[PDB]
Amino acid sequence: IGLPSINISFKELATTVKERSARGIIAMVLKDAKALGLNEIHEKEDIPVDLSAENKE
Amino acid sequence: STVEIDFEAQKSYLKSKGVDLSYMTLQEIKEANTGSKVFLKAKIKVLDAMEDIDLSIEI
Amino acid sequence: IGLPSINISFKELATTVKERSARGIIAMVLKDAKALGLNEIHEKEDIPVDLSAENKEYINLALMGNVNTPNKLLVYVIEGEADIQTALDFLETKEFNYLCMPKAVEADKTAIKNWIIKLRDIDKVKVKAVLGKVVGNHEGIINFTTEDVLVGEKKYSVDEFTSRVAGLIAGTPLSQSVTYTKLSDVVDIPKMTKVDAESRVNKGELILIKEAGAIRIARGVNSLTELTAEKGEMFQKIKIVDTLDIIHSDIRKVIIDDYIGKVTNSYDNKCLLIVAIKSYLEELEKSALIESDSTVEIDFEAQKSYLKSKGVDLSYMTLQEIKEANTGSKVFLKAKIKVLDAMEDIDLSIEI
Amino acid sequence: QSVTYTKLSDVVDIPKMTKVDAESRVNKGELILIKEAGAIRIARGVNSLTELTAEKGEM
Amino acid sequence: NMEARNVMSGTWGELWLDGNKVAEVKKFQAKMEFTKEDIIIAGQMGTDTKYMGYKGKGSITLYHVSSRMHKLIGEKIKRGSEPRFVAISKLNDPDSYGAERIAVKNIAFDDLTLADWEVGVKGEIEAPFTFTEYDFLDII
Amino acid sequence: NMEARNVMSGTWGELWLDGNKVAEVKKFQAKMEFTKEDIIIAGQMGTDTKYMGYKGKGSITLYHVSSRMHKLIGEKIKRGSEPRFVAISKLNDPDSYGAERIAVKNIAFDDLTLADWEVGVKGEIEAPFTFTEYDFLDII
Amino acid sequence: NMEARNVMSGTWGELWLDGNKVAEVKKFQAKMEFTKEDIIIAGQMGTDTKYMGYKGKGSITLYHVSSRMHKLIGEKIKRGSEPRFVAISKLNDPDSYGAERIAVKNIAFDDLTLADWEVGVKGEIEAPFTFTEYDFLDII
Amino acid sequence: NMEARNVMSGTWGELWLDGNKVAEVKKFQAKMEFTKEDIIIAGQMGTDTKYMGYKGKGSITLYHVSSRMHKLIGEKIKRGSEPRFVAISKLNDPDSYGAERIAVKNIAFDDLTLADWEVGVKGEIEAPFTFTEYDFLDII
Amino acid sequence: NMEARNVMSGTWGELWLDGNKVAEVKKFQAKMEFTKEDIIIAGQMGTDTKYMGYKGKGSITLYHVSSRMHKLIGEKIKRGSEPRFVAISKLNDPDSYGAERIAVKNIAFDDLTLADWEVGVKGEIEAPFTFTEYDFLDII
């Protein structure tokens, strides 16, 4: 369980992204020469690095 | 929290003594005589204390 | 009990003493073969006669403050032929703000630098050291680099004048900064050009300069030079870091004394903790150490992340239920504050 | 209450110990003292039980 | 989307005073009354108002089971030292949308009841107060 | 830990006046009403208060069985000598946590009822008073 | 030593006015209301009072069977001569400890009812008064 | 364009005196009274005036929390060396068009209050003054 | 830093006159009125002033409990030998920053009240005075 951790940290200012919606599912089919299969995507920050820039955008 | 009769332990004890469990009602098993033994079970919950704190201060 | 005493005596005027500061505790490590241990010094006259004269001058240097004398000096004495680690291990237990040691060498400065970085980053105790020639990349290290400081026809090296600097910093009220503070007792310093002073200040050094009038401090910077998104330019200033360390110490005291291991980790007790911290911040706002409109609240993103890391299913779970969910023995909070800087740079354009 | 972080005032000196070593000792099942600004204190109110099973949890 | 079950019942209220739970609480009230002053504008038939500030007023009622208020303020009031307090009120009805928790701060009580009893009547204590600040924790 | 049986019943009250037990007591009340004056602080929307002191007010009700009040004050009041008294109130409910006993001192009564009767109505006496000091003996 | 039977019943009251028995009396009341003025003492938080005097106030209610009050005061009041009276009230309950008899003196009535009647309502007369003196005869 | 919310409230006023902020300020006044002399012109029925100068008059009222005025002027006035001061007044109501900030210079106070206290009354200080110069910073 | 509790209450005032404590004091005043003469400078629209001196004025109010002022001054004033006094005023409110103690010296009273009574009114005495010197002991 480790030692007790009491950490008070100071840091510069930061922003907040928009809240999410539980409405809307889109199916998109694209042809690629690498990493064939089914890929579920939750956010645009996390897209697997295999796809081309053209398909990434 | 709850307290109740430990039905399964009573059944295992009754089996160990040699009584029949087929053609016996569940009420019949629950109220059966058990010599000098009493089988019970319960359920409780207990919470932890405060020992770790994270406070992130933006300046 | 004796006879009644009506004792009326006459004498000439006595020299006034500068007022004491409620803030600022200095620990200084000295070496002498005699009178070892820890000595607590309050006034300039109370100095154990067993120390050599040089150590007496070092203590007298640390006693002089800027606007007030430092609140307290803690003196630890070691004979020698031993590691400085022996004094550092003992000082790990005491409470102080600044650490200096007039006699040191490169490996000894390395020990002090590593020790203070360890305390600040791992042991979560905000302390600072004033060292002679150290290139620490930390806000906990103040690099005072000025050679051969002359006071009253004497020779002070860079490492042995840091007692005066530490007393100066500890003697300054929190609303002010040490930039352009003048040292009346200093008489001479080596010839220095403005371009060189600019370069040294840019590199993170605390230096003396000769300006209009007497000798004074150039700028109130730390040794920090590498700036990231989390750590901007404000972390380079001595005054800001002093305020932040005071906030850290006070909040830590409240938490450790009243809450750790004392109360069950339920949502009601978390709310009580939030109210306590908010009241402390309001107290700070009433003294103008920080600006108005500061906030404290539950850190929702961090709690969601912890709950997810434990295998909880955040599906059709209300935001209220997530906010109030049990989190073992952990608490996630966040806050916002604002601190202002001192006046240091002025442009005035005059049309004639 | 718990004895976690309870301070012992009359103690004034303790052998030095690094943080990773203290972590490892606590995870081994030992009650240890640690050094802090101010007095000395207990690290974590832990047992010597280390082998956990489906019937004996971390509580 | 509005149902009768959503209305909050006062039986699901809780109260902390000076950091301590008040198990014998009967009612809790806190309200900001605005100071408004009339201003007649030339050419306008309807009289308007200017907002100048507010006065915080409240009250607590308890069943008489202990000497809570006596211990809180009695000796200090006689010596000329007036204490100030923080109260936290929570309303969490299981059939409502959510919980409403509010901190009321800088509380100064209006009086102190030393004794109030009558034969055949159960004891209750009514304690009015004033206040100047507040904070929202968990609004709906 | 809060139970309905813990609430103190007024039937378990007793009263001493001028050192004598009052067996015919119906109710007893004593309260300190604080004097508070408004103070508006520049830059603050909520108006605060300053505590200036207090005024002690109380009352006693008795069944009419004797001429207790007449003997206590009647002849002295007419001559211009005003007497002052000490009262001790005790509340000791056997089902409560403990007892509450308070001495109320420097009592000055507000009036004197010489007669108040009506055909078909049982006699009662209400005696308001003021006071300035008190002591706690056996709080809960 | 306190029993419910000891409480005095108002049905056992009697009244004499101007030396004559009043058989039709319904209620009688007489009370001294003290004049008290606040005095704040330097260094004391509790406000004290100074006794300055009293004002006697009372009332009589009668069933309307005759013209008693008309004859007592009507002609004299119109001419500017105001009469003053003595009243004696006695309360003697056979189950009480003893009797209470008090003389109320220098009585001046507050008004005079010439007529007050309503169809379907039995007649009654309420006569308030003031007074300045009294004597105790047979207190308990 | 004009609405009741635009009227400036006095609660949003702040004051600096001799470089130091005074948090206990209750009110602030400063005004220039013009000196005018009548002049009758031959052939004209309406009498006109000639402007000759002005005299600056003002006042500050504070809650009594410290000995501010004593320290500012008491010792110097006794020795015969009169000090002069600068005051800055700011009025910044969030619902108004903007801020109004004014410096009032060469201030000479009219008197000094050593003590003014009464039992049951909170302490206040009134300090009138005269002045000759001013400057506009942030007009609307 | 500035809160309503810091305002000094007059109930915490105390007074010494000619070395003897005055327990019956109601209020105390002492103030220095400056003498100022107008001066118009050529080329300047704002008229300035020159400080010339001061006149000390004050007063004391007491509840009438004894013949204090009679004994202090009556016989001496008739013979033509005017006495002079020292007064010490102390204001020590427990909720304030600290105590304010001042000595007012060379006091000469303006009059002497031999009698002032009215039926139904409690007695009070007002005693104005003049003074020339003072000293600060315990400023804030």
Numbering used by the authors:
A (entry chain e): 3 to 59
B (entry chain r): 296 to 354
C (entry chain F): 3 to 354
D (entry chain r): 178 to 236
E (entry chain G), F (entry chain Z), G (entry chain Y), H (entry chain C), I (entry chain I): 3 to 142
Study text:
Here, we report the atomic structures of an engineered diffocin, a contractile syringe-like molecular machine that kills the Gram-positive bacterium Clostridioides difficile. Specific attachment of baseplate tail fibers to receptors on the surface of a target bacterial cell triggers conformational changes of the neighboring baseplate, which leads to reorientation of sheath proteins and contraction of the entire sheath assembly.
By applying the corresponding symmetry during single-particle reconstructions, we determined cryoEM structures of the collar, trunk, and baseplate regions of pre-contraction diffocin separately at resolutions of 2.7 Å, 2.2 Å, and 2.6 Å, respectively. The sheath protein (CD1363) has four conformations in the pre-contraction state, all sharing the same structural domains but differing in the tilt angles of the N- and C-terminal extensions. We define these conformations as conformers A, B, C, and D. As the trunk assembles from the baseplate to the collar, conformer A forms the first layer, followed by alternating contributions from conformers B and C, and finally, conformer D terminates the sheath by interacting with the collar. The inner surface of the tube has a net neutral charge stratified between alternating positive and negative charges, similar to R-type pyocin and T6SS, but different from phages T4 and 80α. The shape of the diffocin in the pre-contraction state mirrors a syringe, and its typical length is about 146 nm.
